[PDB]
Design a protein around this ligand. Structure first.
Ligand SMILES: Cn1ccnc1-c1noc(C2CCC2)n1
Ligand SMILES: [Zn+2]
Ligand SMILES: [Zn+2]
Length: 565
C-alpha cells in the first residue's frame, strides 16, 4: 500500500511544499485522498460546415458542437466466480499464446510512433524522444521498476494521461499485445483488432450462420469502473508466458501502476488532489483496449458456461465442476470464442440457445452489470444480424447491379455529419482544416458510399479542397490515391467474402441503399432544403475555393449520374 505508493506521493509533496494541505472537505469516499496543492472546447470545421448547409437547422447535428461513476465501489465476487475467472483466464492466455511470442517493444519503435502522431522540460512529445536526458530518467525509473519500486508513474485525470516516460515503460512491457495483433480474429477467434469497419459487417454475418439462439449485444454500465482487483490479477497472468527482464518489467507495470494507482485530479473549490485506488481500469488507451477485450472474452465465455449448465452456482465450485469447466474449455472453448465479436467492452454473442438471456448470476457477480435493464431481467436478443449494434454501427446487405453482395457499415447520418464538423484546437490553419474535411470526405466515400447525401457531400468536399493537398483499426482513406481505386482494392480485390474480382469501372456501378432505407437512417433526400443544396452544389464548392484561393482543384461532381450532363 503506502510502501508502493508513498515514494510517488512523497516526491509530489516536495515539488509543492509551499502549498500542501490535507483538506478535511475532500469529496472522495472510495478513492483514498492523501493531500492537496495549488494549480478542451470542440471547434467547428468550416470547410465541412459550408458544404453541409441543410444540416445548419438540424438540432441533432448543431447541438453536437456545443458545451459519479469513478467514485463507486465494486464488491469482491463469490469464491465460485473467482475460480471460474482464474481457470478461464489461464486457458485464454494459453490459447492467445499458442501462435504468438511475447516480447519487449523498443525505444526505436516508440520513437517512430511519436513522429507519425498516434494519441498516447520539453514542449512536444517529439522533442523529448531526441533528448538523451529523458532516456536517463526512463533508465532511472526502469531500474527502480526492476527492484519493485516506482517514483514518477502517476495518472493525471481530465481520461488517464501520464508523462511520456511512464507511457514508454508501459509500451515496452505490454505493447506486444497490440503491436503483434494478439486480439486479431485469427489469433483470438472473438477479437476484431485490425479488422476495419468494412469487415465487421461480414464478421457479424459469419457469426449469424452458426446454429444457435438470438444474437445478444448487452452494453455494460461504465465498464472501466467495474474492473475488479480479481480482473487485474487474471490480466497479470500474461506474465506467466514471459521470461528474463521482460517478465520483471511487465510484473512491475501490473503491480505498481495498474493494481496500485496514484492520480492527480483538478478540483475547482482550483487545487490538485492526490488519490490512490487499487481497482478500476487505468492504463494507456491501447493497453486498455487489449485488456478490456481479454476480460470481456473471459466474462462472455463464463456467461456461455452458465447458460449451458456447466456449473450450477457461483457460491462455490465442486471439484468435479472444475473438471467440467476445464473440459468444456478444451472440448468447445475455441468453437464458443468463434460465436462472438468482441471489441474492448463491446460484444455480440450468438450462444448455443436462448438460456443465455437469463444466465445473469456470474455476469452480475463479476460486476459487469448490463446498461438500461433491471439487474435480473432477461436480455432481449436480436433475430437479424442486420439489426445488431456493434462499434456504434449497424450493417446492411447491399446487392450490386451485377448480383455481387456488399456488407456495408451504417449509422444515423446526423451523427456522421455532426462528427465531420467537430475537432479540437484554436491553433489550426485553413489548409489543415481543409485536409481534415478531405480525411472525412474520403472515409465517407469508402465506408458510407451507399448514403446518397454523404456520397454527394464527399464529392463536394474533395472538389473544394486542392486535389494534391493530402488528408490527415485500418485507415485506407488516409491517402492521395484516387478513391475509386482504393474502393476496388478494399471492397473487391482484398475482400475475402467477394469471389468474383471484376473491378468496378465507375462510381455509378456502386449502389446506394433503397431510398426509404436511406431516409430511415437519417437521409434528407425528399426535403426542399436538400434539393436546393444538391442542385446548387457548384456554388458552395466555389465559395470554399474562393476562401482557400487560386490553387489546383478537380471537379468530382460529374462522377455522379445527375451532374454528368
Ligand atoms: C489536423 N487535426 C487533427 C486533429 N484536429 C485537427 C484539426 N485540423 O484543423 C482543425 C480545425 C479545428 C476545427 C477545424 N482541427
Ligand atoms: Zn514507475
Ligand atoms: Zn443504416
Amino acid at each position: 500500500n503506502l510502501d508502493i505508493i508513498g515514494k510517488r506521493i512523497e516526491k509530489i509533496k516536495q515539488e509543492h511544499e509551499t502549498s500542501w494541505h490535507y483538506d478535511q472537505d475532500h469529496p472522495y469516499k472510495t478513492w483514498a485522498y492523501h493531500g492537496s496543492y495549488e494549480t478542451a472546447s470542440s471547434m467547428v470545421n468550416g470547410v465541412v460546415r459550408l458544404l453541409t448547409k441543410p444540416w445548419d437547422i438540424i438540432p441533432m447535428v448543431t447541438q453536437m458542437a456545443m458545451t459519479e461513476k469513478v467514485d463507486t465501489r465494486t464488491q469482491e465476487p463469490k469464491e465460485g466466480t473467482k475460480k471460474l475467472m482464474k481457470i478461464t483466464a489461464e486457458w485464454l492466455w494459453k490459447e492467445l499464446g499458442k501462435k504468438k511470442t511475447p516480447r519487449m517493444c523498443t525505444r526505436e519503435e516508440f520513437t517512430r510512433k511519436v513522429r507519425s502522431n498516434a494519441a498516447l522540460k520539453w514542449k512536444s512529445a517529439r522533442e523529448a524522444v531526441e533528448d538523451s536526458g529523458f532516456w536517463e530518467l526512463v533508465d532511472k525509473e526502469r531500474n527502480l521498476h526492476l527492484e519493485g519500486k516506482c517514483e514518477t508513474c502517476v495518472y493525471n485525470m481530465m481520461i488517464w494521461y501520464m508523462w511520456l516516460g511512464a507511457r514508454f515503460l508501459e509500451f515496452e512491457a505490454l505493447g506486444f499485445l497490440n503491436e503483434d495483433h494478439w486480439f486479431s480474429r485469427e489469433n483470438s477467434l472473438s477479437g476484431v483488432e485490425g479488422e476495419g469497419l468494412h469487415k465487421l459487417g461480414y464478421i457479424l454475418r459469419d457469426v449469424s450462420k452458426k446454429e444457435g439462439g438470438a444474437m445478444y449485444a448487452d452494453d455494460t454500465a461504465g465498464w472501466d469502473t467495474r474492473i475488479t482487483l480479481e480482473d487485474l490479477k487474471n490480466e497479470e497472468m500474461v506474465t506467466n508466458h514471459m521470461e528474463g527482464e521482460h517478465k520483471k518489467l511487465a510484473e512491475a507495470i501490473f503491480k505498481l501502476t495498474y493494481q496500485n494507482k496514484v492520480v492527480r485530479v483538478q478540483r475547482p473549490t482550483t487545487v490538485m488532489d492526490i488519490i490512490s485506488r487499487r481497482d478500476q481500469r487505468g492504463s494507456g488507451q491501447v493497453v486498455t483496449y487489449g485488456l478490456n477485450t481479454f476480460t470481456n472474452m473471459e466474462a462472455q465465455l463464463i456467461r456461455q458456461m452458465e447458460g449451458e449448465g456447466v456449473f450450477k452456482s457461483i457460491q462455490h465450485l465442486t471439484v468435479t465442476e472444475e473438471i467440467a469447466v476445464k473440459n468444456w474449455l478444451v472440448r468447445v472453448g475455441r468453437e464458443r470464442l468463434s460465436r462472438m465479436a468482441i471489441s474492448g467492452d463491446d460484444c455480440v454473442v450468438k450462444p448455443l440457445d436462448d438460456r443465455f438471456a437469463s444466465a445473469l448470476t456470474a455476469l452480475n457477480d463479476m460486476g459487469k452489470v448490463r446498461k438500461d435493464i433491471q439487474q435480473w431481467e432477461p436480455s432481449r436478443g436480436w433475430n437479424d444480424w442486420t439489426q445488431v449494434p456493434f462499434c456504434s454501427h449497424h450493417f446492411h446487405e447491399l446487392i450490386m447491379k451485377d448480383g455481387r453482395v456488399l456488407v456495408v457499415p451504417c449509422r444515423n447520418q446526423d451523427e456522421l455529419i455532426g462528427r465531420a464538423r467537430i475537432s479540437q484546437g484554436a491553433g489550426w490553419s485553413l489548409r489543415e482544416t481543409a485536409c481534415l474535411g478531405k480525411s472525412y470526405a474520403q472515409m465517407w466515400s469508402l465506408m458510407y458510399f451507399h448514403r446518397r447525401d454523404l456520397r454527394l457531400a464527399a464529392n463536394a468536399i474533395c472538389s473544394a479542397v486542392p486535389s494534391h493537398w493530402v488528408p490527415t483499426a485500418t485507415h485506407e482513406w488516409m491517402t492521395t490515391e484516387d478513391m475509386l481505386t482504393v474502393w476496388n482494392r478494399v471492397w473487391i480485390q482484398e475482400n475475402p467474402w467477394m469471389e468474383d474480382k471484376t473491378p468496378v469501372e465507375s462510381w455509378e456501378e456502386i449502389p446506394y441503399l433503397g431510398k426509404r432505407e436511406d431516409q430511415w437512417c437519417g437521409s434528407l433526400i425528399g426535403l426542399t432544403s436538400r434539393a436546393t443544396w444538391a442542385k446548387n452544389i457548384q456554388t458552395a464548392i466555389n465559395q470554399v475555393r474562393s476562401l482557400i484561393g487560386n490553387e489546383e482543384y478537380t471537379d468530382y461532381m460529374p462522377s455522379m449520374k445527375r451532374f454528368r450532363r
